[PDB]
Write a structure and sequence with these properties.
- The structure is cut from a larger assembly and holds seven protein chains of seven kinds.
- By secondary structure, chain B is mainly beta.
- Chain B has strands at 13-18, 22-31, 37-48, 51-57, 61-63, 68-72.
- Chain B is built from no helices and six strands.
- In chain B, strands 1, 2, 3, 4, 5 and 6 form a six-stranded antiparallel sheet that branches.
- Chain E is mainly β.
- Helix content of chain E is 10%, strand content 53%.
- Chain E is built from one helix and six strands.
- Chain E has one helix at residues 5-11, and strands at 16-21, 25-34, 40-49, 53-54, 58-61, 66-71.
- In chain E, strands 1, 2, 3, 4, 5 and 6 form a six-stranded antiparallel sheet that branches.
- Chain E is globular.
- The relative contact order of chain E is 0.29.
- Chain F is elongated.
- In chain F, 31% of the residues are buried.
- The E-G interface holds E 21, 25, 33-35, 39, 41, 45, 53, 55-62, 64-65 and G 1-2, 5-6, 8-9, 15, 19, 35, 45, 62, 64-70.
- Strand 5 (61-63) of chain B pairs antiparallel with strand 5 (67-71) of chain F.
- Chain D: It is found in: Nucleus.
- Chain D: Residues 1-61 form the Sm domain.
- Chain D: Keywords: Acetylation, mRNA processing, mRNA splicing, Nucleus, Ribonucleoprotein, RNA-binding, Spliceosome.
Chain lengths: 65, 74, 74, 61, 72, 89, 70
């Protein structure tokens, strides 16, 4: 993969999703398909979820925080 | 299997729903897994917001499968 | 030359990506793959300055290249 | 195949109904077009990369 | 040491889950199972637009439009 | 793979193509591919309002994914062939 | 585990919901790997209003959001 997600883990990231969703969370886990596991997940649509899993296939953009 | 039960109606009048509130009725001539379609003697109705427009194509319209929602009989 | 090759060798250049979203992104290019997924450094995004960004290929509309481009890769 | 269009000027219609004029330089199997001297009349850029997704229509002029 | 996401879905099997589409729809029910494409089997699922329906039995939810999964 | 074959049997025929964005283009089918991309020669305007912003250009590459309908004439197509080949798949 | 499901409920009564919000109640004749469905069922749940009644139907698998039993 072109992005080394290893650095990010235990770091707060900002992910845009296809369909106009923003999510900010703490990167707990990830895969080669770019599915993520986020912690303290807040979804800006304020919406608070917790430990979420984000489908890599709709993962549209990813920055830090 | 759902694609075979479509072979079932070949040469049999069919009713087709497409994205964008359009509806076709015509005689099934051909289809593919993509549910691409050829129909003949087919009338299309477009509902635009309420009015409905029509369009006739007797000879043989082809239809790209990706717009297709439903395929049944009138 | 092919889009992908062009990007592949435009590594280290500056470019401006339009998203399907309507978002403009100004950055220097760091990595590209065959899906056209991008990583950029020194980033500014317009509806925000960031260190690094990742962009899925399927969400790009078009990429403005620096005019240097042809001479820099080739 | 878009091969007969290489290095010639083209009309480009995007799916959203927008219209471009450019030199077609590169193109791939996914219809990613590589473009030069583009105009949308105000010039957009000297070099630009465009996604196959956005292409409705190419015309040779 | 890495936590794989599919492993996170695996352990929420038989639990309550919220499934958040890429649209403004949401489903909460018991997670019965999932595949590699993350198609999803829910049981007795509430359907919401952000209450549309109370489902009784088993729902296959197409992984295609799934955006977020939330245990609990 | 079938509709490719079909379109190949349609070359040098006049057809009317309707794309999703409400654009309508008459012309001569010169080429056909696996994506069902079409190439038309001798571009022309079927309808007054839909027709996009062209003129001098006479040849177009149309992306398959952007076509809704292809308009055909009962004369251009053997129906029975089609039917048994569709059965065949 | 999803395949087992597709084979478990065939011939049971199901609601199939499409991307557009339309819903189709009918009997499950079959279903393939691409989510194509064989239905021939009514288009209205009840309260909103029944929009069509069709005996046999095909639902394009790209459009399906879910397949649910009652």
């Amino acid at each position: 993969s072109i992005l080394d997600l290893s650095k990010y883990i235990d770091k707060t990231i900002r992910v845009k999703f296809q369909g106009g969703r923003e999510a900010s969370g703490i990167l707990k886990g990830f895969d080669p398909l770019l599915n993520l596991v986020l912690d303290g997940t807040i979804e800006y649509m304020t919406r608070q979820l917790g430990l979420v899993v984000c489908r890599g296939t709709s993962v549209v953009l990813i920055c830090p925080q | 299997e759902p694609l075979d039960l479509i072979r079932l109606s070949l040469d049999e009048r069919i009713y087709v729903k497409m994205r964008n509130d359009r509806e076709l009725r015509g005689r099934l001539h051909a289809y593919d897994q993509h549910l691409n379609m050829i129909l003949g003697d087919v009338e299309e109705t477009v509902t635009t917001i309420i009015y409905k427009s029509t369009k006739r194509n007797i000879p043989m319209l082809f239809v790209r499968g990706d717009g297709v929602v439903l395929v049944a009989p009138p | 030359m092919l889009p992908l090759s062009l990007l592949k060798t435009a590594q280290n250049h500056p470019m401006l990506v339009e998203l399907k979203n309507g978002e403009t992104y100004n950055g220097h290019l760091v990595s590209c793959d065959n899906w056209m997924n991008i990583n950029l450094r020194e980033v500014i995004c317009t509806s925000w300055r960031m260190p690094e960004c990742y962009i899925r290929g399927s969400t790009i509309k078009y990429l403005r290249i620096p005019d240097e481009i042809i001479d820099m890769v080739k | 195949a878009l091969e007969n269009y290489i290095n010639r000027t083209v009309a480009v219609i995007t799916s959203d109904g927008r219209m471009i004029v450019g030199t077609l330089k590169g193109f791939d199997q996914t219809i990613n077009l590589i473009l030069d001297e583009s105009h949308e009349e105000q010039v957009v850029l000297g070099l630009y990369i465009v996604r196959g997704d956005n292409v409705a229509v190419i015309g040779e002029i | 040491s890495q936590l794989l996401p599919l492993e996170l879905v695996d352990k929420c099997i038989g639990s309550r889950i919220h499934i958040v589409m890429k649209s403004d729809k949401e489903i909460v029910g018991t997670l019965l199972g999932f595949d590699d494409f993350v198609n999803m089997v829910l049981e007795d699922v509430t359907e919401f637009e952000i209450r549309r329906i109370t489902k009784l039995d088993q729902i296959l939810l197409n992984g295609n439009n799934i955006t977020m999964l939330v245990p609990g | 793979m079938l509709f490719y074959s079909f379109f190949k049997s349609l070359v040098g025929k006049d057809v009317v193509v309707e794309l999703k964005n409400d654009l309508s283009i008459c012309g001569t089918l010169h080429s056909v591919d696996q994506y069902l991309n079409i190439k038309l020669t001798d571009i022309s305007v079927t309808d007054p309002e839909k027709y996009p912003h062209m003129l001098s250009v006479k040849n177009c590459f149309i992306r398959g994914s952007v076509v809704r309908y292809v308009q055909l004439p009962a004369d251009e197509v053997d129906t029975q062939l089609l039917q048994d080949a569709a059965r065949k798949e | 585990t999803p395949s087992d499901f597709l084979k478990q409920i065939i011939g049971r009564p199901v609601v199939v919901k499409l991307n557009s919000g339309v819903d189709y109640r009918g009997v499950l004749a079959c279903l393939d790997g691409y989510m194509n469905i064989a239905l021939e069922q009514t288009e209205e749940y009840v309260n909103g209003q029944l929009k069509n009644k069709y005996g046999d139907a095909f639902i394009r698998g790209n459009n399906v959001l879910y397949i649910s039993t009652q």
